[PDB]
From Swiss-Prot, chain A:
This is Proteasome subunit alpha type-5. The modification Phosphoserine is found at residue 50. The 26S proteasome consists of a 20S proteasome core and two 19S regulatory subunits. The 20S proteasome core is composed of 28 subunits that are arranged in four stacked rings, resulting in a barrel-shaped structure. The two end rings are each formed by seven alpha subunits, and the two central rings are each formed by seven beta subunits. The catalytic chamber with the active sites is on the inside of the barrel. Belongs to the peptidase T1A family. It is found in: Cytoplasm; Nucleus. GO terms for cellular component: nucleus; proteasome complex; proteasome core complex, alpha-subunit complex; proteasome storage granule. The gene is PUP2. The keyword Calcium does not apply.
UniProtKB/Swiss-Prot annotation, chain B:
It comes from Saccharomyces cerevisiae (strain ATCC 204508 / S288c) (Baker's yeast). There is a cross-link at residue 190 (Glycyl lysine isopeptide (Lys-Gly) (interchain with G-Cter in ubiquitin)). Pfam families: Proteasome, Proteasome_A_N. It is found in: Cytoplasm; Nucleus. One of its GO terms (biological process) is proteasomal ubiquitin-independent protein catabolic process. Present with 7210 molecules/cell in log phase SD medium. PROSITE patterns: PROTEASOME_ALPHA_1, PROTEASOME_ALPHA_2. This is Proteasome subunit alpha type-6. It comes from the Eukaryota.
Curated annotation (Swiss-Prot), chain E:
It comes from the Eukaryota. The alpha and beta forms are probably products of the same gene with different post-translational modifications. Present with 12000 molecules/cell in log phase SD medium. Its main location: cytoplasm. Keywords: Acetylation, Cytoplasm, Nucleus, Proteasome. One of its GO terms (biological process) is proteasome-mediated ubiquitin-dependent protein catabolic process. The chain holds residues 9 to 248 of 288 of the full protein. This is Probable proteasome subunit alpha type-7. The 26S proteasome consists of a 20S proteasome core and two 19S regulatory subunits. The 20S proteasome core is composed of 28 subunits that are arranged in four stacked rings, resulting in a barrel-shaped structure. The two end rings are each formed by seven alpha subunits, and the two central rings are each formed by seven beta subunits. The catalytic chamber with the active sites is on the inside of the barrel. Belongs to the peptidase T1A family. The gene is PRE10. The keyword Acetylation applies. The proteasome degrades poly-ubiquitinated proteins in the cytoplasm and in the nucleus. It is essential for the regulated turnover of proteins and for the removal of misfolded proteins. The proteasome is a multicatalytic proteinase complex that is characterized by its ability to cleave peptides with Arg, Phe, Tyr, Leu, and Glu adjacent to the leaving group at neutral or slightly basic pH. It has an ATP-dependent proteolytic activity.
Curated annotation (Swiss-Prot), chain F:
CDD domains: proteasome_beta_type_1. This is Proteasome subunit beta type-6. It is found in: Cytoplasm; Nucleus. Non-catalytic component of the proteasome which degrades poly-ubiquitinated proteins in the cytoplasm and in the nucleus. It is essential for the regulated turnover of proteins and for the removal of misfolded proteins. The proteasome is a multicatalytic proteinase complex that is characterized by its ability to cleave peptides with Arg, Phe, Tyr, Leu, and Glu adjacent to the leaving group at neutral or slightly basic pH. It has an ATP-dependent proteolytic activity. The gene is PRE7. It comes from Saccharomyces cerevisiae (strain ATCC 204508 / S288c) (Baker's yeast). The lineage of its organism: Eukaryota, Fungi, Dikarya, Ascomycota, Saccharomycotina.
Length: 244, 233, 239, 204, 240, 222, 212, 241, 198
């Protein structure tokens, strides 16, 4: 077990501390993102300890701006930090340029935040010991590359996706998605899609309480689907299965 | 069975080695492949963008630092960005203050002296990424090989990354030829392209996998993305 | 792998986990709300009683005229939080006129509990807490719980401390999610009986504090709390 | 543009055979407008006495600052501060703020509980010590006081007489100074007992 | 034995030995104090045919009168040079007169010194040879990881130091009056070749510089060009 | 005492043509009653099809431009060579300018280019930061000699339709670039005739949806 | 300059001129003196252009942060307070600026806070600041009532600003009008004083003394 | 996770580091404080003995903290003096600011808060002291307070700390009428104290005392740290040779 | 300057304070309360520099309220005024002093007696039977010296004060737009709102 201490290099040149943080995100409840030339969807499994917690209390999906939403997975305390830096990074830009920030440019800032942690500092002060125990599903729309979807990894790196899923049943979905996704997916299509892979690799009987759902478009911007829209959408779902 | 001499970047092995820095070079060997090659009219960087999944984008490995300079990288993105970023300032300092375009020899100097610090002080760790640099100053073309160990060497061409060998050799041989390819860009590239394809194993390169960069005698540093490189396949 | 500022293979920060183990060690608190009130119940570790009744402390603490909180865990700690919260409660009102939002408050508190889990050379607050109150010019009862790690959460009714698991169960099949306890009187009736599990007779181990809107507030007296034990044991015997 | 001269007030002290005395007026007011006639410039720390003239807030602040310190002295040393000692202190204290001086004019006086020797001192706003064996004057009508004292001080008076002298000295100089008056008070310090007296004067 | 600050049961700092151990392991460097001025030379090792010749210089000038070279850990060397560069230029701005080689060493010795005092820092991994002129002649010293240095008639470190050592030995006696400025170079040119015979299967590139009021004119110039060639050939004949 | 500021004359001008934009400003440079250089450019291209000029105190001026041309460069580095919409540039300048609020840049600065629709656009600046979207502004020494004119010629101010009594103001119409440059040259000559700090030459940068054009016309060396 | 704002039965009314001026010469008549802080708020512009303009935008940012955190609309009182606090930080430094911060919240109802570079925070029902503040307070005082036809409120504003424009040399150009409600503000265009004047004197019969 | 460091948390939410110190107390001289409806009593038994040690022009157990407040020590001598000092200072800032006497409750609190401070940060160890606070303020009258190194304070009717304070403790629980006038307490004090001693018998020299009392004839509060004599005497009054 | 009065009577205190607000020339609000209740039984009127005024008051207010819930026990008028003076004492030698004068009225519940403290911006405090900052004293102080008696009822005080006002109107150059009057007593605070119709 020697070789597990943050800035330490494995003899195969690897950083486990980092790699474990990833193993944190695993424990989070599942989150799924789907990008369609029509708009972008963000849906997450809720999973509540007791019926006395007020679902809406769990901010698994949050607004970062009229044009950018987000879903997290894993460590909730750490989330609040990234969410706040991001929210700030956005507004700041708008104050400086009177425009909107490029989704990736934003995303960048966030990853710029992540990997900025030292161990006594071999030059740069970095006040925060270890990496983040959380990942992000950033999903917005700038007018240069239209609709966009990203994956924020604690390692300070990231990737652009068409559809991606983080959380508990990561592969359970990624496999599914791997062969469900196609460009000309409409938005209505995408919703019922996320809503299906959740239910599957989900845990309990799917219903608005255990599943928050949202989306964002050029039209209206980031909107978090109230419990009605979600509820009925369940029906249009659980009905088509009966047939095929 | 045991080895205590590999604790911090700060400790010497009985013989006089720094295992920590040695490991960083291993993560360098782990990342994707990339190539550089020069002549007297231009310089070229060619790299293999590697994607995570099939539903994801390929992580880019080239970066501009000025109209006349750039690099590719083998290893950790973060580490790289930092270094390239620091580099960007250094050129800017020169331009504004002195109004002279930064010489490559000197660019390597700074990246040595920079990465150097991390090998002498406790607390940190060393940079996990290597870089091939290209540029065109007043001494014509130039090309550099940089290691986290702070060693920057001036070459004629090279590769770094996983299975970087096969290209290093292709290059070693076809040398006499390309060092003479002056006035023709597409030639240097096709050459470079062949040198790299001479290292694939998973499969051939596509419009999405490929990426190229160039800089020269009238060719300010520019990059070719995807469908733009289409021809060179 | 326990001395946390580092990760377990499975991505845990065991210290932060253990800290919670102390909130259980401590006393017990429980909060409930209606469509007009929010009651906060607590027990009393009446153990080495040869001490003046008068001035010695009691769990519930007012943070601002319209908001209060309770805890369980290390008293030694708890005090310091309460103080720092009270301070921020004014620093806000000063620099913004408008008096604090209960949600905001908690977020601040949780931010502090959260601050003590990052820099090496500091240790987490062994305190989890219930915060209740009514927002300025608002009649919607608010209940939140914050805990050691830094997470804040809104509950319809929740409990912390030793044997929380039990009473929690009880509450679960009593508190109607659809409709909350209407009247104040009975909203209390509820909380009181929910504590009677762990109490072990005597309103001499039960503290009640009640909060209404428009910065009203009011702790309870012993007999008042007793007249309930009474009117409950009565219907228990009637079942 | 003088601060000292804004609020008003005076204080004077004398040494008698085996005792001391110290008195001050009572007036406090921003230049022309008189404000209070119950403002006292003399207090003490156990058996030590201090009279302070000059700028009002600075006076108050000083009293507080001294009460503070003497309490802390007597505590760790299990004995009250001595006169001569106090002097040297209030001295240094004034100086510590030599570039943001306190606009005042102190005057200390008391009886040393060991030697039994009467004591009196005066200082400028920065802590320069004026050791005297007859009298000390500070305040608005400084000059009028020296005129009285120079005539009236007689080496070694009886406490009952010293009172009458100092009283008259203060009282009369105060009437030729437009910025002091509205009552006064005199203390008489004996080895043990101490007598405080307010006197009747013009209220204009 | 594992930390830098500590002492052994009988007063010994091991980290410094290993420092030394790494200094040896690297290339070989030399230097020679002659008539007036000095001469240096190092061993660049061509590991492949893809190395531009006349390029990666291992020798560096300081101010405009001090030659300087080393061996061991290359970045460590470079680093150390910078400090030496400030110290020099600061002094110069202060006293006007270009910095006395005698003291210079200390300024550096004192800096290499420190890195043997605290545990949080790593010992300097290079042995360094250098010299220059002034009013009272030319000088030449050699600084090690321990920080201890001295004045030599000629110095050597890196891989094969003995070769050049016994080689330097001879010169002393046959020319106990300082070797000719000119011959100094060409002689150095040889002394290197002889000492290279370890990296023999691997070709190399020799680099040379020098100082002299007569030849360089008080300055430090890079021996490159015509004198450079013959100096090689000169070595190439004796190379048998 | 030391006086850290100075005036080097100069007069610049910006007109927002329907689908173009011009930024003209002479080449003279002065100190007291002396000359410094017959030719000295105050108008520049900064890339991204955006022209700038800052008149008042040279040093503060060119420093701003330099400080800006760099802040453009850096914008590309962090956002993948995204083009800077003119509107954006200005919000940015405001800050730069405001950075030195309590030790300002002693200059009236102006920029011109095109918006995200292809319409011409000019922007006038305060010496500390207030910016306005102007469609026509003259700044500099001569300012008050040209502005009254453009008022009239460009906006037909105080000009009515004959025979309407004075009930119908003459309708505005948009003029081709040629038409504009004619106005501009006349404006400067008139100005040179009656203003000592103005004369010598005129350098004009014309912005259009395919680059920057430069045309020069010599004035009087009065 | 002449800006003003007032509260009434229907919400808030804001009116401005547009004449900037350096010494004796008119630098511009195309001045935006109403800072559209954000969809629901407005700030006027007295004192010194840059200061109002800059800070008020800065403030606009500040709201967005708060709002997003709280998932609630920021209340006028606070917004104003913040600006004040920020301004106080610089009392002495040389910041010059008069201004009305106007909003209409869920609870607060319509509400104006005049604020200045001296840190004066002031709740009110009517405010005029500028050179012409004096003439404008005329028309207003006499003609104001709390039950104005939404349209009359808009007319009063015009005319008021207009009196100032005529007399106060340092004021004039064109008037800008905005109305404020529970759901945000609405622009009511620009009106060239030159043209308008002639109109009013005509319809209203007022401005007799004037020839033609 | 075992013993070391204060910043450590054992798998069960225990801070050993503290629990040792919080127990280190059981090594100091037995100090006692008692409440009466007319005065408060602080009794204490000296330690560090030999035959060549003075104690008259000094003490080290009973320290006067305010003209209205007093404390009984029981821990590390070195520690105590530091807190005792800053406890005095702060008390004076309260006076210098509000121009009034600092309330006991408040004072105790602030101190408990520093002790608590050292209970949570790396690079420092907690104070190994325990205090019996005794004083009066017109807000809540007479007050007896206590505090350990855990940073917790407590209101007591009559308490003891240090050595055998479990034995000594119970003796108290017996005889104690809430009103119990002072002399009965001063008396009780010794009764409780004697019973819990390794010395052949109770000798004045090895003993410290003080009391607090106020009234109509004083109009204010007066406290007395008893001098060598008064003690050697009252001891006899309680029937001791 | 503005108008700030205060008078201590039988079992209460009364604070007068003009209503107008001026910006060089025009008068903005003219129904402005220069008051700020610190605690249920303590209150403070003030006049001073434009910004300095309203900031400081609230700030003082903050601290108090804080202390009062923390302790749960209320703070005494005496001690309150001591702290205010403390703060100004520092303020005066700060890089920038808050230029502000004040009157502090409160009902000390322990003594069951009303106390009134006048304090200028220099940090000059004094317990008084009545007072007025600025030029306000000159015009009135006499009438008070004249008719004032410690035993006066709450009403008696109003009449007096009312008379002082009538005078201030008659001989003062400035138009203060009237006055807002307020009473602190064993019951707390209430406003004599009637002083418009009275
Ligand atoms: Mg005098
Ligand atoms: Mg007099
Ligand atoms: Mg050491
Ligand atoms: Mg843009
Ligand atoms: Mg001429
Ligand atoms: Mg006019």
């Amino acid at each position: 077990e020697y070789d597990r201490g943050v800035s330490t290099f494995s003899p195969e040149g690897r950083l486990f501390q980092v790699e474990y943080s990833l193993e944190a995100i695993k424990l989070g409840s599942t989150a799924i993102g789907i990008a369609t030339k029509e708009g972008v969807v963000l849906g997450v499994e809720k999973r509540a300890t007791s019926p006395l917690l007020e679902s809406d209390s769990i901010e698994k999906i949050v607004e970062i701006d009229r044009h950018i939403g987000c879903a997290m997975s894993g460590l909730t305390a750490d989330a609040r930090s990234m969410i706040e830096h991001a929210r700030t990074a956005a507004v700041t830009h708008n104050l400086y340029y009177d425009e909107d920030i490029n989704v990736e440019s934003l995303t960048q800032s966030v990853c710029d935040l992540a990997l900025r942690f030292g161990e006594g500092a071999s030059g740069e002060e970095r006040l925060m010991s270890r990496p983040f125990g959380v990942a992000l599903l950033i999903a917005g729309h700038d007018a240069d590359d239209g609709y966009q979807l990203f994956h924020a990894e604690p390692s300070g790196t990231f990737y652009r996706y068409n559809a991606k899923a983080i959380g508990s049943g990561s592969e359970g979905a990624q496999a599914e998605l791997l062969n469900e996704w196609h460009s000309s997916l409409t938005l209505k299509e995408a919703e019922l899609l996320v809503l299906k892979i959740l239910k599957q690799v989900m845990e309990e009987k799917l219903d608005e309480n255990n599943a928050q759902l949202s989306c964002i478009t050029k039209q209206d911007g980031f909107k978090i689907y109230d419990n009605e829209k979600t509820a009925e959408l369940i029906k249009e779902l659980k009905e088509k299965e009966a047939a095929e | 069975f045991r080895n205590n001499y590999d604790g911090d970047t700060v400790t010497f092995s009985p013989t006089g080695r720094l295992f920590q820095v040695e490991y960083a070079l291993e993560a360098i060997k782990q990342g994707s492949v990339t190539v550089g090659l020069r002549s007297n009219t231009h310089a070229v960087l060619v790299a293999l963008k590697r994607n995570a999944d099939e539903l994801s984008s390929y992580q880019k490995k080239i970066i501009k630092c000025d109209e006349h300079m750039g690099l590719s990288l083998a290893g950790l993105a973060p580490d790289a960005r930092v270094l390239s970023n620091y580099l960007r300032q250094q050129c800017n300092y020169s331009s504004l203050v002195f109004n002279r375009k930064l010489a490559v020899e000197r660019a390597g100097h700074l990246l040595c002296d920079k990465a150097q610090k991390n090998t002498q002080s406790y607390g940190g760790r060393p940079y996990g990424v290597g870089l091939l640099i290209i540029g065109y100053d007043k001494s014509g073309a130039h090309l550099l090989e940089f290691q986290p160990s702070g060693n920057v060497t001036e070459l004629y061409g090279t590769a770094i990354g996983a299975r970087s060998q096969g290209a290093k050799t292709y290059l070693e041989r076809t040398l006499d030829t390309f060092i003479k390819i002056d006035g023709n860009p597409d030639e240097l590239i096709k050459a470079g392209v062949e040198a790299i394809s001479q290292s694939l194993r998973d499969e051939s390169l596509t419009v999405d996998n490929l990426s190229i960069a160039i800089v020269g005698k009238d060719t300010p540093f520019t990059i070719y993305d995807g469908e733009a490189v289409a021809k060179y396949i | 792998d326990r001395a946390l500022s580092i990760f377990s293979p499975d991505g845990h920060i065991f210290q932060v986990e253990y800290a919670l183990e102390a909130v259980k060690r401590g006393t017990c608190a429980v909060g409930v709300k209606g469509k007009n009130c929010v009651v906060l119940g607590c027990e009393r570790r009446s153990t080495l009683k040869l001490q003046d009744t008068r001035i010695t402390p009691s769990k519930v603490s007012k943070i601002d005229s319209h908001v209060v909180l309770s805890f369980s865990g290390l008293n030694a700690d708890s005090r310091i939080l309460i103080e720092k919260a009270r301070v921020e409660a004014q620093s806000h009102r000063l620099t913004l006129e408008d008096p604090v939002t209960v949600e905001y408050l908690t977020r601040y508190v949780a931010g502090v509990q959260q601050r003590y889990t990052q820099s090496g050379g500091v240790r987490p607050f062994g305190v989890s807490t219930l915060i209740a109150g009514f927002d300025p010019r608002d009649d919607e009862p608010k209940l939140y719980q914050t805990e050691p790690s830094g997470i804040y959460s809104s509950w319809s009714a929740q409990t912390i401390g030793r044997n929380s698991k039990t009473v929690r169960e009880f509450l679960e099949k009593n508190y109607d999610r659809k409709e909350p306890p209407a009247t104040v009187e009975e909203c209390v009736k509820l909380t009181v009986r929910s504590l009677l599990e762990v109490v072990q007779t005597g309103a001499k181990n039960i503290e009640i504090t009640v909060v209404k809107p428009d910065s009203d507030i009011v702790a309870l007296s012993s007999e008042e709390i007793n007249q309930y034990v009474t009117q409950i044991e009565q219907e228990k015997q009637e079942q | 543009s003088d601060p000292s001269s804004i609020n008003g007030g005076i204080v004077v002290a004398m040494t008698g055979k085996d005792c001391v005395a110290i008195a001050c007026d009572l007036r406090l007011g921003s230049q022309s407008l008189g404000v209070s006639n119950k403002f006292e410039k003399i207090f003490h720390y156990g058996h030590v006495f201090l009279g302070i003239t000059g700028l009002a807030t600075d006076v108050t602040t000083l009293n507080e600052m001294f009460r503070y310190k003497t309490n802390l002295y007597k505590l760790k040393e299990e004995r009250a501060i001595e006169p001569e000692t106090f002097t040297q202190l209030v001295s240094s204290s004034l100086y510590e703020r030599r570039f943001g001086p306190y606009f005042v004019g102190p005057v200390v006086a008391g009886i040393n509980s060991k030697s039994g020797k009467p004591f009196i001192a005066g200082f400028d706003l920065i802590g320069c010590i004026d050791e005297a064996k007859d009298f000390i004057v500070s305040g608005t009508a400084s000059d009028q006081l020296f005129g009285m004292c120079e005539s009236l001080y007689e080496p070694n008076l009886e406490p009952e007489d010293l009172f009458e002298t100092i009283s008259q000295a203060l009282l009369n100089a105060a009437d030729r100074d437009a910025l002091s008056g509205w009552g006064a008070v005199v203390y008489i310090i004996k080895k043990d007992e101490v007598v405080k007296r307010y006197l009747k004067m013009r209220q204009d | 034995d594992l930390s830098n600050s500590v002492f052994s049961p009988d007063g010994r700092n091991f980290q410094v030995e290993y420092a030394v151990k790494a200094v040896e392991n690297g290339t070989t460097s030399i230097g020679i104090k002659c008539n007036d001025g000095v001469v240096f030379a190092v061993e660049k090792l061509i590991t492949s045919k893809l190395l531009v010749p006349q390029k990666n210089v291992k020798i560096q000038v300081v101010d405009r009168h001090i030659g300087c070279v080393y061996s061991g850990l290359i970045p460590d060397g470079r680093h150390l040079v910078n400090r030496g560069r400030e110290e020099a230029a600061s002094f110069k701005k202060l006293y006007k007169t270009p910095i006395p080689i005698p003291a210079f060493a200390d300024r550096l010795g004192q800096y290499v010194q420190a890195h043997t005092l605290y545990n949080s820092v790593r010992p300097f991994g290079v042995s360094t040879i250098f010299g220059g002129v002034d009013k009272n002649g030319a000088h030449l010293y050699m600084l090690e990881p321990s920080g201890s240095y001295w004045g030599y008639k000629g110095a050597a470190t890196g891989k094969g130091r003995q070769s050049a050592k016994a080689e330097l030995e001879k010169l002393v006696d046959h020319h106990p009056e300082g070797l000719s400025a000119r011959e100094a170079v060409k002689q150095a040119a040889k002394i290197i070749y002889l000492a290279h015979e370890d990296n023999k299967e691997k070709d190399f590139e020799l680099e040379i510089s020098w100082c002299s009021l007569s030849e360089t004119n008080g300055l430090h110039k890079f021996v490159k060009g015509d004198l450079l060639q013959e100096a090689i050939d000169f070595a190439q004949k004796e190379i048998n | 005492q030391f006086n850290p500021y100075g005036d080097n004359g100069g007069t610049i001008l910006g007109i927002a043509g329907e689908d173009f934009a011009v930024l003209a400003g002479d080449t003279r440079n002065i100190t007291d009653y002396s000359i410094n250089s017959r030719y000295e450019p105050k108008v520049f291209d900064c890339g991204d099809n955006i022209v700038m000029s800052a008149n008042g105190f040279a040093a503060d001026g060119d420093a701003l431009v330099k400080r800006f041309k760099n802040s453009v460069k850096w914008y590309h580095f962090d956002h993948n060579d995204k083009k800077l919409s003119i509107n954006s540039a200005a919000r940015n300048i405001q800050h730069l300018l405001y950075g030195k609020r309590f030790f300002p840049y002693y200059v009236h600065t102006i920029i011109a280019g095109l918006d995200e629709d292809g319409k011409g656009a000019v922007y006038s600046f305060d010496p500390v930061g207030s910016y306005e979207r102007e469609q026509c502004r003259a700044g500099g020494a001569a300012a008050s000699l040209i502005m009254p004119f453009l008022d009239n010629q460009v906006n037909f101010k105080n000009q009515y339709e004959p025979g309407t009594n004075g009930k119908v103001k003459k309708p505005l119409k948009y003029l081709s670039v040629e038409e504009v440059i004619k106005l501009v040259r006349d404006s400067f000559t008139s100005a040179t005739e009656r203003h000592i700090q103005v004369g010598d030459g005129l350098e004009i940068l014309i912005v259009t949806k395919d680059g920057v054009r430069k045309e020069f016309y010599e004035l009087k060396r009065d | 300059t002449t800006t003003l704002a007032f509260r009434f039965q229907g919400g808030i009314i804001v009116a401005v001129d547009s004449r900037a001026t350096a010494g004796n010469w008119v630098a511009s008549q195309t001045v935006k003196r109403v800072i559209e802080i954000n969809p629901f708020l407005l700030g006027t512009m007295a004192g010194g252009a840059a200061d109002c303009q800059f800070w008020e935008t800065w403030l606009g940012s500040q709201c967005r942060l708060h709002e997003l955190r709280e998932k609630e609309r920021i209340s006028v009182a606070a917004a104003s307070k913040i600006l004040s606090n920020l301004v106080y930080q610089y009392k002495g430094a040389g910041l010059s600026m008069g201004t009305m911060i106007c909003g209409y919240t869920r609870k607060e109802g319509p509400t104006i806070y005049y604020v200045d570079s001296d840190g004066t925070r002031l709740k009110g029902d009517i405010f005029c600041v500028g050179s012409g503040q004096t003439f404008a307070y005329g028309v207003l005082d006499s003609n104001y009532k709390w039950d104005l036809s939404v349209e009359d409120a808009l007319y009063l504003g015009k005319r008021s600003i207009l009196a100032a424009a005529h007399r106060d040399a340092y004021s004039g150009g064109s008037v800008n009008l905005y109305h404020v409600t529970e759901d945000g503000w609405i622009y009511h265009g620009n009106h060239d004083v030159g043209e308008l004047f002639w109109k009013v004197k005509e319809e209203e019969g007022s401005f007799n003394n004037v020839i033609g | 996770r075992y013993d070391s460091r204060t910043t450590i948390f054992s798998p069960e939410g225990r801070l050993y580091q503290v629990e040792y110190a919080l127990e280190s107390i059981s090594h100091a001289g037995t100090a006692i404080g008692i409440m009466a409806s007319d005065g408060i009593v602080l009794a204490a038994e000296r330690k560090v003995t030999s035959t060549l040690l003075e104690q008259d022009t000094s003490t080290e157990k009973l320290y006067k903290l305010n003209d209205k407040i007093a404390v009984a020590v029981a821990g590390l001598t070195a520690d105590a003096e530091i807190l005792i000092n800053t406890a005095r200072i702060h008390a004076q800032n309260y006076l210098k600011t509000y121009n009034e006497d600092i309330p006991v409750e408040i004072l105790v609190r602030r101190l408990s808060d520093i002790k608590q401070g050292y209970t949570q940060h790396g690079g420092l160890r907690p104070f190994g002291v325990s205090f019996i606070y005794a004083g009066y303020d017109d807000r809540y009258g007479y007050q007896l307070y206590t505090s350990n190194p855990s940073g917790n304070y407590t209101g007591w009717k009559a308490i003891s700390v240090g050595a055998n304070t479990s034995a000594a403790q119970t003796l108290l629980q017996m005889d104690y009428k809430d009103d119990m006038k002072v002399d009965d307490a001063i008396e009780l004090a010794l009764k409780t104290l004697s019973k819990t001693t390794d010395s052949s018998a109770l000798t004045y020299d090895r003993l410290e005392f003080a009391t607090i009392r106020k009234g109509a004839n004083d109009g204010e509060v007066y406290q007395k740290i008893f001098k060598p004599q008064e003690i050697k005497d009252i001891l006899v009054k309680t029937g001791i040779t | 300057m503005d108008i700030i009065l205060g008078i201590r009577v039988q079992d209460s205190v009364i604070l007068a304070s003009s209503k107008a607000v001026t910006r060089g020339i025009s008068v903005l609000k003219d129904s402005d309360d220069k008051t700020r209740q610190l605690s249920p039984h303590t209150l403070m009127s003030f006049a001073g520099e434009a910004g300095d005024t309203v900031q400081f008051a609230e700030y003082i207010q903050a601290n108090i309220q804080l202390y009062s819930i923390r302790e749960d026990y209320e703070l005494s008028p005496q001690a309150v005024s001591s702290f205010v003076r403390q703060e100004l004492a520092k303020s005066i030698r700060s890089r920038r002093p808050y230029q502000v004068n004040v009157l502090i009225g409160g009902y000390d519940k322990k003594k069951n007696k009303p106390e009134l403290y006048q304090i200028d911006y220099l940090g000059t405090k004094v317990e008084l039977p009545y007072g007025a900052h600025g030029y306000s004293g000159f015009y009135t102080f006499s009438l008070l010296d004249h008719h004032y008696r410690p035993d006066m009822t709450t009403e008696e005080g109003l009449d007096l004060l009312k008379l002082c006002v009538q005078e201030l109107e008659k001989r003062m150059p400035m138009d203060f737009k009237g006055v807002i009057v307020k009473i602190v007593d064993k019951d707390g605070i209430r406003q004599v709102d009637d002083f418009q119709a009275q």
